[PDB]
């Protein structure tokens, strides 16, 4: 009393166009991100000889964004070849480790800057410059350590495998057989809780508080703008919201909470890839928001260049 149906999924018809366009845009992300982050680091290091109290987070953030951008060429090479990995296992492990560590570090430094901007009005207002410098250095070390700790487990299990029939080599994660669902789900939770939930919550709450504090004062609100703060919050959403929505839909597909069919395969492949390209505007937009808008930075850059 069991009906054995069959379903054959054809090949992907129009994925070549998608991969072409994605690579075309990854080139621009790489070029612009590389240039912008290099300039930020250069001026941050070189502005200490003029007397500025340059900030550690905006230097570490620039370095982390630069490292992530450095691995785009590897991803493009793997992407153009229908998502195949000509390189060896060592290259895949190293690339994944570098990318993961620096991406997590970038997000964590954004959250830390959000908190520090508010504390700099309310709390770090009668604190000697030396004391606050020491506090910032300790926080930088801790954030880098935390990013590395989160990234290690995922890279541990990464292994390149050649399909026994397709004769094509891929690089994926091979978790222990006796527990794979408990691993996949688990990892996803982390990537959604320490990646979007907690960082976004802290960012939104503390930037609202900063806007309230600026509005209360008179000199501050005359000089400071309340639209750039809302720009910070909304930019984080636009970059990182659709990506996590697509990934969660993928997970619900894996757990068979949604019925399977070829349309979902196509409409989830397309969603994952398009959102992955969008989410990397993180590195392109970070300098343009925290550095290139500041009047002090623009004047300093103009002087240094000339």
């Amino acid at each position, epitope marked *: 009393c069991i009906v054995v149906d069959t379903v054959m999924c054809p090949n992907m018809p129009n994925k070549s166009v998608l991969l072409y366009t994605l690579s075309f845009i990854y080139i621009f992300i790489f070029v612009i991100g590389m240039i912008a982050n290099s300039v930020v680091v250069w001026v941050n290091i070189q502005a200490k000889t003029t007397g500025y109290d340059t900030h550690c987070y905006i230097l570490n953030l620039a370095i982390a964004d630069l490292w992530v951008v450095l691995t785009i060429p590897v991803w493009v090479v793997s992407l153009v070849q229908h998502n195949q990995w000509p390189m060896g296992e060592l290259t895949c492990k190293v690339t994944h480790l570098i990318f993961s560590i620096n991406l997590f570090g970038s997000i964590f430094f954004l959250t830390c800057m959000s908190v520090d901007r508010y504390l700099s*009005i309310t*709390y770090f*207002t*009668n604190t000697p410059s*030396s004391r606050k410098k020491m506090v910032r250095r300790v926080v930088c070390i801790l954030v880098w350590l935390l990013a590395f700790c989160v990234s290690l487990p995922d890279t541990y299990y990464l292994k390149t495998v050649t399909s026994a029939s397709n004769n094509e080599t891929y690089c994926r994660s091979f978790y222990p057989e006796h527990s794979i669902k408990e691993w996949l789900i688990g990892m996803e939770l982390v990537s959604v809780v320490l990646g979007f939930a907690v960082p976004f919550s802290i960012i939104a709450v503390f930037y609202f508080l900063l806007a309230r504090a600026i509005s*209360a004062s008179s000199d*501050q609100e005359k000089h400071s703008s309340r639209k750039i703060i809302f720009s910070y919050v909304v930019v984080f959403l636009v970059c990182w919201l659709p990506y996590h929505v697509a990934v969660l839909l993928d997970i619900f597909s894996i757990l068979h909470y949604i019925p399977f069919t070829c349309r979902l395969e196509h409409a989830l492949f397309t969603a994952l890839h398009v959102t992955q390209c969008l989410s990397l505007v993180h590195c392109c937009v970070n300098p343009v928001l925290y550095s290139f808008i500041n009047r002090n930075y623009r004047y300093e850059l103009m002087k240094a260049f000339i």
Partner: antibody
Amino acid sequence: VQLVESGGGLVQPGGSLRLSCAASGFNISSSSIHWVRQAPGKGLEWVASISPSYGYTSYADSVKGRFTISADTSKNTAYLQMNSLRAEDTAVYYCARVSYWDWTWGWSKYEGMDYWGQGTLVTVS
Amino acid sequence: DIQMTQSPSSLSASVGDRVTITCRASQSVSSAVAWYQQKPGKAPKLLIYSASSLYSGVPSRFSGSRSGTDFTLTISSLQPEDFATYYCQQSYYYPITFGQGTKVEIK
């Protein structure tokens, strides 16, 4: 911006006094209020400082344990309470502001006491 | 606190001349030294904040510099309004420490 100092007046040795610095033109909670002094025919000397937001205060080594600085944000005021005054405490006390500018956060400088007050003459006979 | 030695204690420079004052710290202060001037019996006014960033309003004559822990202030043309006392300060470590002053008097 304008800071006005009220207080002064000669006091007896070992007595006490209470100076007040009231600021108009800015929210006192977004800047630190410093008290400086200049003895008769001598150079400036630091006395105390306060953050009127959460109450972090710092004192000089000479006067630590005798002076207490406390701010009230409703009226934009900062008070210095002097106890167990000695003879050398005779001076002219100014209240100054160390400004903080939010629009320069990532790329800022080491702000100094841009705005001062006329300060009051404290005598200790 | 951190001592800060300022020399010399008196300039006899005449009008229109170049005057230089120096203040050397004990430890290292990272460009957190400011120069103030005070007229006889008047409140001081900020002249230079940070190592060299001139304050917004003071003439362009005044200019500060830094060399390790050896800061200096230069007034290019001692216009008659520039006869007063000048103090060097540091904010990098509390308590804030001033200099000894340097009275500038006409020849």
